[model samples]
Target chain A: SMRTQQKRDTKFREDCPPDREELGRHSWAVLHTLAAYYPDLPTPEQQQDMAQFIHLFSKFYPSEECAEDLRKRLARNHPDTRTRAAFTQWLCHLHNEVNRKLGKPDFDCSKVDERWRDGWKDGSCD
Target chain B: SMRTQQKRDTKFREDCPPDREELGRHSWAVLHTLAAYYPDLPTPEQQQDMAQFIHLFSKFYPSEECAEDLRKRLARNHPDTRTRAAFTQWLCHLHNEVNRKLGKPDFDCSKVDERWRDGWKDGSCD
Candidate 1:
């Protein structure tokens, strides 16, 4: 029994770099999140800046395949980043678009803030 | 003591939202890493897009306090986005600036690729 454990320890483990899925998830985590904290009444400059972030992130995301899909989707439906609610919905719609492309179920758009900003009313996420 | 251990488990364990530190680290992980895989000589549009991403990120970062410091720092230093090398170094410089503000040590600028893109020479990270 001790020999079995020793043999297992002989092999070294290396941390592999993140793949497309991990990067996509982390990227979305940051992207969708900014909307929740986006100013309620953003300045003209702030609004333009947020729009630019979305546009540029679409170009610079790690995976070309993923970025290509987002670029195509965004081109069809321009981002609506007017207010926090508008921005959140805009992001949710795009995520749904990407999810559909990946055969993932759609996340309910109604729970934009509940998912990203505040935890669920049941206090599942504290 | 036994009761306390079992009682401790009674507390709800929910994934807390990423605070500024968690969010900032993930954001930087994605941001600095783009350069490593970036086309050696990006198209004109790609270059402009990368520039815009940096400009926008400074404004839209979740923390106004953190963004304000970056804004002040960036005004004096125009980012170099002409090539992957330039972009990586520019990012490292900005990070060093932020690290200084937080009373942290500066990461050597020479290791930009090793730190972000490639595995280190020593194979420690592998």
Candidate 2:
């Protein structure tokens, strides 16, 4: 009976993870919602913490290829060049976070590896 | 001199938010790292929490269109039809999380909107 009750308790509402429009196409909200349904996953509070951390990481330090607009945003609004530089250096790490989490780095090599060896081998955000 | 030192303290390392694999693409790592670089963003603890929550929400209940592989995975392991049903109904909400955060929508209407009005659209994860 308790087991059934627990299973029932785990049954989330249809309207959970409320809708919003600021998170973007690929958002922490989408990520957290996915994790929430896993029985073997972490608790909501823990997941929330992770979500926050991830969000910060994505904004200050993105993994994907940077476009001109993104570059400008980081450089203009954020004068902390050091932080931007840090993010640039860790671009591979940040972008590959999902692969690392899924235990599947081979899924997207474009994000997992970097061709900095051939390029102007220097640490810069711009 | 002390003020300068404090400012330096605030200056983050060039390789913060170390990478991992379980997270995959669009991970919490990316998000947290981004927030880390911002001057007025939340603390590490808070960001981390948010990251975790976002991850959970994403996994347990996705807002985007579910694929055949994903559907099979959820249906096979997660026997609770109710949980699956909950996810199906809230797809719009989950997808919109990014827009809510960025305060910008209309980027990817494919993921953000669901034209289920005139169609035979009932709630089903499959």
Who wins the lDDT comparison?
1
lDDT of 1 by residue, A40-121 (tens): 8888878888887888888887788888888998889988888888898888888898888789999998887777677677
Q: What is the TM-score of each candidate against the true structure?
A: 0.80, 0.20
Q: Per-residue lDDT for A1-126 in model 2, tens only?
A: 454545235544331121222223235323333332323345555444444433433444323443333454444443211232232334334335534645755333232212321112343311
The top-ranked prediction according to TM-score is 1
Instruction: Please list the residue runs of candidate 2 whose C-alpha ends up more than 4 Å from where it truly belongs after superposition.
Output: A1-121, B1-25, B28-81, B88-91, B106-126
Worst 10 residues of 1 chain B by lDDT: B7-16
Instruction: Give the clash count for model 2.
Output: 100
Q: State each model's CA lDDT, in order.
A: 0.77, 0.34
Residue-level lDDT tens digits of model 2 in B52-82: 4334334433323433333544344442112
Look at candidate 2 and tell me the lDDT of residue B100.
Answer: 64
